[PDB]
Amino acid sequence: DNSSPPAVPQTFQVAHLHAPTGSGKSTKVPAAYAAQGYKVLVLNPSVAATLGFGVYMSKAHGIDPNIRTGVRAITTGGPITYSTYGKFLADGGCSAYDIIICDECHSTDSTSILGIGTVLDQAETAGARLVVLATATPPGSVTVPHPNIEEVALSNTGEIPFYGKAIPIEVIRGGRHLIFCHSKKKCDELAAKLSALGLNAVAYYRGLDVSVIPTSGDVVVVATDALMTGYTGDFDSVIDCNTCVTQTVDFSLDPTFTIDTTTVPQDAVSRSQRRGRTGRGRRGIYRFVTPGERPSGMFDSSVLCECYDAGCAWYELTPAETSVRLRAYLNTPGLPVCQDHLEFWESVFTGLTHIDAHFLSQTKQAGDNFPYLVAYQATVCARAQAPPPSWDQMWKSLTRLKPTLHGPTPLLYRLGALQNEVTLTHPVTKFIMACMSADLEVV
Amino acid sequence: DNSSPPAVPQTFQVAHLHAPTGSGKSTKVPAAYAAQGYKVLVLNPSVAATLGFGVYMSKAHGIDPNIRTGVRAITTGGPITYSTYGKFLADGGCSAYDIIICDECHSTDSTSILGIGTVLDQAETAGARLVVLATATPPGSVTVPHPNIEEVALSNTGEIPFYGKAIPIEVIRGGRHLIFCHSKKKCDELAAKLSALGLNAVAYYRGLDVSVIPTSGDVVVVATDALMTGYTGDFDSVIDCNTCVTQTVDFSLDPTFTIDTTTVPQDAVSRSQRRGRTGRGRRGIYRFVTPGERPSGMFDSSVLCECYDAGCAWYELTPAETSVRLRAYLNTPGLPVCQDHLEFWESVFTGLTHIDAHFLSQTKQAGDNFPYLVAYQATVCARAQAPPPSWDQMWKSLTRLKPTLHGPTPLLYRLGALQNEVTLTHPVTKFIMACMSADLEVV
């Protein structure tokens, strides 16, 4: 049904394309639309993917497309353009293209979600005949059985307790095995427990080397998801804790909301990926704490906030402009889904007035999450000559003013751990609290 | 048809099983035959695969099978036994098992071919009810299109001549690319040509390190098939010369036959494998000198010779015993195929009388190809006080006698390059020449 590329409707259509990564959906398909005389934009969340498409197209097909990223925009004048969603947003959206392919349209990072809503809101007005929502992983996808992987639940019987169940020593003594834990911390403690017990064991996370994992010999690697992005092949078995760390918003009311990195049950995509490290060129084993529960393509409300934040920080969009684009995304069927907290987030940002410009550009440059919310809290701090909620790296634009800031932090919301006393008097704190309780979904 | 495991016939059946590597054919299938009360032997060409199955079975299913290789035989007493074909032959064949699974039955190395003929000849007499010829690559398989790989023939247009066609510089300037050449020699010359031209290029073959290939950055790797067995992932494109080196027999009549490593067009398996280095997690390009021509599962007559040789050297089989087993293999449909040179090879070896025992064990130990033919030539040399055909490593059991060997080599056949004068007088030379011309297929 959605596995063939849509023929161009001679007016306006939104269409889905479910096809594997590499299969032609982002290359051969735009090539065929271009040979019929169309101009085609193809959007993707990744700078590397985007650059990779221009290499393929010119070398396979002698087609030199325009390649547009945050760094540079390469204009050849040909009919196909590749861009990241972020560069697309930075360029004003549709502002040119007959057909727009939104690639990896299952992505739930904020640039993808804002970028996609923008296409959906603007595509027809801008002269487009076709928007394609393309993906290899449609929303509601679950982990399906693999022919080469045998799946065996852990029980309570075992000498090594692990996320509420147990690993018998015998199933990891001998051969090469990968245990997934959620944090650098568990990795280290489990790695150390196992080593006490006589096992060749080694931790791996963000910021250690790939060479810390022996090519050969019995090993138990206790790792985070950093592994899949840093390292190549192997494994007789995977032991999956079945949880990850994700950005979540909590309407904690202490005074307002909390945005932090918390432990959530994994979704199908993380389950599929962690399992997929065994079964390569021979049979594999996958062991797990709990059966697959979350389908792919649900995202957190704090990603809606992040969209509003980036709209203000990067793209000179008022919160109301951000809502039209997000509304178009939430109103389009077959896309990732989320609680409808558009009115609420819009209203919060609408009263985040008179941010310090130099603070915001410092935060933007340093690359911290939520550049607008961090610089706004900082602004508020420097205007009350108060310290930031902690001296986390986040707050470094206040470090030069550190000797002159005294007293309780005027807390607007929580972006991490609290390390100073707080006052809840601030007019903006009050404003955000009233945004919460003026919204039936958020109260 | 051949994708489901055969139910046990209550008398005797030979059956085929076509199923992917890892899918259960060598593990789950024997497990299910064992739960019904059968004793199951599972044979494979690889020590590592064989050991890998015992790890899987005990860890996935709490089944500790017997694991038998050249090194050691592990006896647990359970109903499933894994063995290499070679260990099976060393143990006397069927000499116990209800069901015998011949795994990787498409293999065309001599141990697999002799091992398989032995099962086929002996299985019924020995009480077996079932022989399964199992494989992921049936004979006559061709290279089929891959959804993620775009295939583009080279033409004559290009600045870099390559196996009778050309590579334009533009298709390898920028990005990461793998060129296959047939010999360490071409690798080095092409690598050096490309470097002169401004390209980051690096050779790779048997005996250089994996680290000689940069993880990141534009590179052109000019390699042999050593690459697939030494190194892990990548590549925007593969450029395949479409030829490999294989052991071939030539009835050269100078005086008798030649067995040497020569350049042949590649078969589907080598084509599939070399192509398969691109298209991983994104789209790939494969370029080639000539369209796929050889289907898998044809092997050379010199593999029949090697079987006879190993029978004499390792397994105390007379040539006539070797023929009954090879005959059973050639008479069984759906197996690799070869010219029927059984009578001829049998007759050659039957007159290879009174080999020196110490020479043969030296050759066997040193691991040279054709241990019987090398030690027989050597024997013949030491009895004529003549030098070996060259001082290649092959002939090292004659090195201690080197000051006393003089005159022309009495050539029985050719196993490499000739580096001394030769006499064709030797009675055994005459005998082998008459084996050739007494056989209608070989004349």
Ligand SMILES: Cc1sc2ccc(Cl)cc2c1Cn1cc(CC(=O)O)c2ccc(-c3cc(N)cc(N)c3)cc21
């Ligand atoms: C650096 C970040 S983090 C983040 C998180 C959420 C959202 Cl919605 C945007 C963002 C951005 C903004 N952002 C993301 C991309 C994507 C890419 O790498 O090509 C990107 C590309 C270009 C720009 C960009 C470039 C210039 N010259 C000026 C301005 N104001 C923005 C901003 C971009």
Ligand SMILES: Cc1sc2ccc(Cl)cc2c1Cn1cc(CC(=O)O)c2ccc(-c3cc(N)cc(N)c3)cc21
């Ligand atoms: C070392 C070689 S190269 C070659 C080539 C062709 C053929 Cl038909 C056999 C052979 C052999 C013999 N060969 C191959 C294997 C397989 C494995 O590694 O388990 C193997 C295993 C065991 C034996 C083996 C073991 C003992 N103790 C005595 C004797 N006479 C043979 C010989 C073996």
Ligand SMILES: [Cl-]
């Ligand atoms: Cl605002």
Ligand SMILES: [Cl-]
């Ligand atoms: Cl003999």
Ligand SMILES: [Mg+2]
């Ligand atoms: Mg593609």
Ligand SMILES: [Mg+2]
């Ligand atoms: Mg250790």
Ligand SMILES: [Mg+2]
């Ligand atoms: Mg298997």
Ligand SMILES: [Mg+2]
């Ligand atoms: Mg170089």
